[PDB]
């Protein structure tokens, strides 16, 4: 468990608040990444407001792959998860905007009109102590 306690004046600039509203309710998984790149990539993903899991979870909506022909690629492929490239996160953070993952689709015939109506969120502390 983790308690929620935070209080401090932040800069006026558009902090992680605006970005957190981009991927609000999304879960990204890092696969085939090595620091410092691995670290940099993760952070960015957090800003957008996406959840970073150490492995494919039942709550995982999108998978961040560094290159095809990987073990974690086919795995999430057969399951039915949305396998996309990193360019999605890099561009999202870099542009701090919501980009269509469909254009960055690695596997699958295409979005099967699978949209969400009501999702849950949490983690009122993007500051990974």
UniProtKB/Swiss-Prot annotation:
Domain of life: Eukaryota
Cited function: Scaffold protein involved in DNA single-strand break repair by mediating the assembly of DNA break repair protein complexes. Negatively regulates ADP-ribosyltransferase activity of PARP1 during base-excision repair in order to prevent excessive PARP1 activity. Recognizes and binds poly-ADP-ribose chains: specifically binds auto-poly-ADP-ribosylated PARP1, limiting its activity.
Quaternary structure annotation from Swiss-Prot or TrEMBL: Homodimer. Interacts with polynucleotide kinase (PNK), DNA polymerase-beta (POLB) and DNA ligase III (LIG3). Interacts with APTX and APLF. Interacts with APEX1; the interaction is induced by SIRT1 and increases with the acetylated form of APEX1. Interacts with (poly-ADP-ribosylated) PARP1.
Consequence when changing residue 38 to A: Abolished binding to poly-ADP-ribose and ability to inhibit PARP1 activity
Gene: XRCC1
Source organism per UniProt: Homo sapiens (Human)
Identification of the protein by name: DNA repair protein XRCC1
Impact upon substituting residue 53 to W: In a colorectal cancer sample; somatic mutation
Biased composition (Basic and acidic residues): 8-16
UniProt tissue specificity: Expressed in fibroblasts, retinal pigmented epithelial cells and lymphoblastoid cells (at protein level).
Description of post-translational modifications: Phosphorylation of Ser-74 causes dimer dissociation. Phosphorylation by CK2 promotes interaction with APTX and APLF.
